[PDB]
From Swiss-Prot:
The active site is at D57, E115, E203. This is Peptide-N(4)-(N-acetyl-beta-D-glucosaminyl)asparagine amidase F. GO terms for molecular function: oxidoreductase activity, acting on paired donors, with incorporation or reduction of molecular oxygen, reduced ascorbate as one donor, and incorporation of one atom of oxygen; peptide-N4-(N-acetyl-beta-glucosaminyl)asparagine amidase activity. Gene3D superfamilies: 2.60.120.230. It holds the Pfam family N-glycanase_C. InterPro entries: Cu2_ascorb_mOase-like_C, N-glycanase, PHM/PNGase_F_dom_sf, PngaseF_C. Cleaves an entire glycan from a glycoprotein. Requires that the glycosylated asparagine moiety (reaction 1) be substituted on its amino (R1) and carboxyl (R2) terminus with a polypeptide chain. It is an enzyme of class 3 (hydrolase). Changing D57N: Complete loss of activity.
Amino acid sequence: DNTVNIKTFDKVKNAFGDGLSQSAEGTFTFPADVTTVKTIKMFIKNECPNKTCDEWDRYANVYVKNKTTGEWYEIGRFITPYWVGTEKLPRGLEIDVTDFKSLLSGNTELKIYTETWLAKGREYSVDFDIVYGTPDYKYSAVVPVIQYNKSSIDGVPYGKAHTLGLKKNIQLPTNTEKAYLRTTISGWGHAKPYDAGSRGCAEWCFRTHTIAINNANTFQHQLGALGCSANPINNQSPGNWTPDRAGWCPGMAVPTRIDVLNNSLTGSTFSYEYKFQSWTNNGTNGDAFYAISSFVIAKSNTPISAPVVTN
């Protein structure tokens, strides 16, 4: 297994106000053949010497553009650490993006965004390690099921009525050999009523959501304690970095959840539904939202087309 490293963004800035952009885009060249790709890792480095950056814990994410549809697909999400950058981590934050190998090839458009509200913003460098070898499956295709993830407050309203579709029908190519879902979810808000411990939703309140397949509860996503106090990025004081949030920590990547689908669904049309654990916002302390992206990945040893997602 030979590994090649590809540099992309180099010290790009995400910032706000007076001629600035919270996002940055660029075109980069990746190798064209991915049939040999075993793994692809993305590394995000953020240098923030001397308190020169927006000091808050901000929502940030990276997308790749699907040339075929023109849509941006979220491939990685993280929360900036308080006060400092990723200096304690020699390579920066690491996120496995192998699932998107079909799009990471040739001339590729990437975009990086930070929900920063200050001119100091954050500055990043992003690189990818591509590992060649002999994969289980040579071919893969990926498509979104839902993407309500433009920002922390642009996600799905939690505890209030909304009009967003959370159910879809998915159709996998008949020659699919393996399929699975890739979900990234993170909550925002200190909304009341609080759970015990004064934990408001959706940032602090521990919840377990469910993915239903064909109407049967199939996968559970526990948004629990990751152990923020053990963050190797531990030079965040005086920021409130050590308490556990529900499913995330400041200065860490938001976890990627992979749910393997039953083969019996292959070459069929099935329903998908993301169900949030029941809760009602009393509205006395702000709102709550869950930012989520969920994609279906289909793999095969024969060339495969994209699954079809419909309402």
